[model samples]
Target: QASTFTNPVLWEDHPDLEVFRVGSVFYYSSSTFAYSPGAPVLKSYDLVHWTPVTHSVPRLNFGSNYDLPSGTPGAYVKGIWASTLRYRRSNDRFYWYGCVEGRTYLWTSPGGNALANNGEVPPSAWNWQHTATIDNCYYDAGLLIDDDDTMYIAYGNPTINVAQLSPDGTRQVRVQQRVYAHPQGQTVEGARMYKIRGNYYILVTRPADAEYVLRSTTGSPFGPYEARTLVSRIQGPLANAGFAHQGGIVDAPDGTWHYVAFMDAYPGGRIPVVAPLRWTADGWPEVVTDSQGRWGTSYPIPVRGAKNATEGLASTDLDEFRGTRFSEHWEWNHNPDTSKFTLLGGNEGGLILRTATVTGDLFAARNTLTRRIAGPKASGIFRLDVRGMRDGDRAGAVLFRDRAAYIGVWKQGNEARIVMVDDLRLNEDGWRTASTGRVAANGPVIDTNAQQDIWLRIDADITPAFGTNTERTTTFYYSIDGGRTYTRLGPAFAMTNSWRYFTGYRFGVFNFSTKSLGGEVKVKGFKMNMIL
Candidate 1:
């Protein structure tokens, strides 16, 4: 219903995007470090309004370690990173190339062409093949396809590597050739390859800092390449936000092109930002910016005057679990223990999460279902049906990350009350043994005869106020009388900004037991209201 779009199109914790255009529709692949079902592939017609289309896998399946490794939590900061997206028109198949657990992987699926025709197959429903596991996991890589159906991947930091793969990507057929974008000291990662007008270009970044593109002077996939800065040291849309770096570049339906990348605004994590670009006379790409060349805000909408363009980033929606499966927007904190959760459909349908682990620490608590916390400012409201919750169970809403805050109903042997809890810190490893947390506030004990649904909400301000991770905060609230009235549960919880937990803040719902695993909670509803 609108035309113009603002900067930083998405507010979610999406990072390292690789977008591909198939006909008129755009497919963007995202990074999922430890989340279950692996990373997602989002589809869009206008490049601004994106919806999750498919995922690489149902689970990380890297090994037992990705399965949480016997409750010890092994894949905290490890899983899939920077998936490269490509569509081979000759065969009408889509491909996802990435590095997972120190191995290069290629996932291919047929029926990609159906997306633009509306007869689309559920992307996640397509089975995958674990194509290659070469020497150094393609480390922050990108895939490129030649006109003759030959393919190659360029990847690395400090020292970049390029490897050629078979036409179907089932196996590697060439030894990796080494090259460098910046000399020895400078790091050059997120290596994506491109071929335009007969020359090969490798897009790379110093992540959260700078982005550069290297052109092969000799027209070879690997060779003496010349480097040029794409985006460097430019401010983002948010105040105090980090630089715009590490994303994909694709052409619009009109043949015009844009660079869609991510910027670090912690707590809100890294979100996608699109900047228009055009090739110069000498074949160099120039990012359109202000007089001084800064990443500006509010660019013209991609494919201007096109129908269905998203006007602003501000949005609101409700998610009442449905059908026999969860929506594409939902993902677990890590690969979850699937046995404890079930999805039901219709008005009576709700997400039922049974307690799956017996650890007291919420960080160690299993079966935590989460989604990206929309940025700048937003509130996540959750409704819980506690009738089936057993004693020693804790279930509620949370603004979770390395530093976390939660408001939920805690059951202690039939005596139940709502508690706002915070400060469950992890050792340097993100997920491990329990760190005790104090209840910040509490509600009156429930009456044995009363029957009502509990509502919990997290109002989050993830603005980069001070250009520091410490500026993000979340306030907790609770209501017993449905959504009619809500009372503050605790002081605002400050979200920590640190590189240790690369994953940013997430608005989530959890159900876990401290004493045993028999308890359960039915998620009645999950709603999000955002302020642009």
Candidate 2:
């Protein structure tokens, strides 16, 4: 058992997370908006340390709307909003219940929940089959399989409801029964349910900035319930640590309980945090408080097996592209053109991403490989070899969110220019790139010394002061001396959160062409390190 651990098990954005324990292993699934291969499956032995195992959804092939375009035709902030991960012991099946666009989908893994069942980790090993769409309007749902084999799901916010499911747990057989209504007047959702000692505990998030668990002990899924707050205040020394609500709960092999929740750390997205759950004399479960009755950012967590940290999590951002496939951390903006991207052959190698025919805008560009920014503060340095790029081609690393900014190199005629762009707004018309004419060195401008190979870095300092409507910034820099000193591109650009892209900021490498197609960029030595 480890005595002390940090608040966020994962520093990156993994919002709307649902976790379940099968045997000694804990499985995690989270919302992936706009990004292809959504609903990532992460596994952890110890609750404090986690790793990315595989993505349950290889690609969100639900409709034609998800297709790539030069604009925002894809599902930007919709696909796999919230999910419930459960393992059926009787049928030996692993089910992934997800809500997207107010619809519920049931997906199953043939080999069950354990990664070993697939014989390997990564994409090819897990075969996730979408079985059915149970409902058209179950949002932020929590699923529970009772001891008597009955299945029920609790969903909604302002007015919480619980519904009975069919025998195979595929369809909602009965009408929804009202369980608990939010009296606090704040928006409530993210419902997760549990059955302990013949009582029904429905864990939900009240957008009033807290996690609450509703209890019913009449041996019925729905009953006269009582609500209790689990965690509300910030629990760590890390900056930008608030909104500790909305997640799932799991029990360890030793009967110790834990709750996995999230914080609304914008620009970085909704990051995950875990806390110890303690049962009171009255059977209510609450977050364990420190000696002063405050929630501690880090606490002692029980470890069932060996204390291993590196096995299950993304410990480093150093991706050499040595494998035939991309790492689990890398996700495309939309469904990507597989033929356009490849790993370079031979010893001197890197990832070769071909530019698709699109306008000179980062939003519509396809084949963009992105990694979530792990923050409070994080830095991403990308080394790009642009020898393969053609005229009208742009390639670089971008901090992509609702509002995005990038620093890269563009080739024009026979000249290469180091350019930095910030996209401040996108509406019904199209994308709007911030005009840098007023700001010095911010541009479509060119430096005569710009070469075929360049190194660009995006540094994000998201440690916002504790208050409402705080400022978050991302700075861009360029390096010409290999790994030595760097030059700042422009002033710190403000990061914004909008309904367009609900997820956190993603740092990605992209190559796109406006005038002509068939341009490529060779990327090497990309490193992203978090300060905390």
Candidate 3:
């Protein structure tokens, strides 16, 4: 009896997805968009549990300017976008292709790095082959292989086009040719092309309604095709979760079809969900809905010989800060000051963050290590050893998407205090720190008396937005008695999105000095539990 799995099999920011299965293991890739170690590729088995295997554009080394700056000069929402992951069984090569700022990149796995070994991804086993300036920006793409060994890329929104590739799949053979253009003024994108049983089909997200599949039986790259709505609505338990659009389809070993698509759950960003797909009598794919006509969230894995294992997988939330290399879950706010971060204590220890010179707001502060906050609801409990902190140091936990809220400890000259900060914006001029108040126990301000440790916690009720507004609340708490007792530090803050920070909400640890540098904090451990 194979175990049933839930929707959003892999939580966190796994959006703009492209997935392909090779043998028993499945490799998934998605847009990172300004996060270093860009183009995250995840591996999974049983279609539920997942692990980060390798990053295609690990350094995002497009140019010297591609590295994020200290201030507002960063990628923002313009690094790597939608990518395509394809496995060519003819040559046994795995190819990752995506466009970054109008230039396309292709990467391949080295000869011996197989997908076996229990889904282990060795960083050194992949090679980036070529980067090209393709026509039409190559947005939201899919890679295709013709039956006669021809390679092509189908991309673009509203006006979809196809580009042919060189024989070796390293470069483009010609500029893209326009194939199909949506006439109804719908924002149609997220194109994945496939040739199955002598018919060509391109699946795309249609605006205002559903997922559409355009079919062409003429065996041609460009087609005058017939279109059908594959899935008009998801109609799930989560409100507005019905917009099940943008993803690829895969067939199991037993030839059963499944579609992996993303639904927008803001504050958490767009998340992926899988549904069983069936073919109609005329050979069109359709996503199955629930008994009340809703998208299916929980279902059995669709593979032959797949076992009903009791143990499943999810993104790791607990970190003991062990080892020289950081956990894959963590990313810096901007490009990190590598020399500022270190690990202390032998083998199993804490993370030491040396303070950096803060120039502007928290968004401008360097060396902020962050991880995506998983939801419905979640709590983050972080312990910091501030024994080494100097005066003028501000270090604590933060909830950052576009806007930010900080709940932390601050030291000013000879006095230390706990403070909560919120960046209040004025019109469209930009963001400014308009509110910073000290947490007090019925007094004006309480001094920390050079306290050696600080425990901070944040509760995020990112329950999918039910009403018209796509906002969630986050609350902050702190404990002085080693978590035996807690005090609410601030009022609930609303999480909002912006074109600047297009990614999901991130919980990060930041330590910076406004007066001078040289202050440091040791992050002992972090425990993040999902309230679902």
Model 2 ranges off by over 4 Å = 112-124, 183-186, 232-240, 309-317, 344-349, 427-452, 464-470, 497-500
For candidate 3, which ten residues in a row score worst on lDDT?
A: 437-446
Q: Give the per-residue lDDT digits (tens) of candidate 1, residues 1-532.
A: 5666787788787888888776677878888888887768777777887767667666776777776645545677778877687777677677787777777666677764565554344544456655455555778888888878898888876767888887667677784556665764787888888888889888889866888888887777776688888888876555666788889788888888889988877767888888889888989887888565677677777855445423212235577875556777788877788788888777677888999888777766677898887778888998888878787888889887767889888888878888889887676654674565889888778654322588888899988543553566788887777689989978888877665566778888988888888877888788888855
In terms of TM-score, the best-performing candidate is 1
lDDT of 2: 0.73
Name model 1 segments beyond 4 Å from true.
1-3, 115-136, 305-315, 429-431, 448-451, 465-470
lDDT of 3 by residue, 203-309 (tens): 88874247888886466776756678887765763564437777888876567888888777666777778888889998888877777777776777665345423
Q: Write the residue-wise lDDT of candidate 2 on 244-349 in tens digits.
A: 7788788887898988887776657777777788899998888876676655677876574444535422646477676565667888887888789888644565
Pairs of colliding residues, candidate 2: 51-312, 51-313, 157-188
Clashes of each: 0, 3, 0
Q: After superposition, how far is residue 143 of candidate 1 from its true place, in Å?
A: 0.6
Off by over 4 Å in 3: 1-3, 64-66, 89-93, 115-136, 145-149, 207-209, 303-317, 343-346, 424-451, 497-501
**Global lDDT scores for all candidate models:** 0.76, 0.73, 0.71
Which residue pairs in candidate 1 have backbone atoms (N, alpha carbon, C) closer than 3 angstroms, thus clashing? none
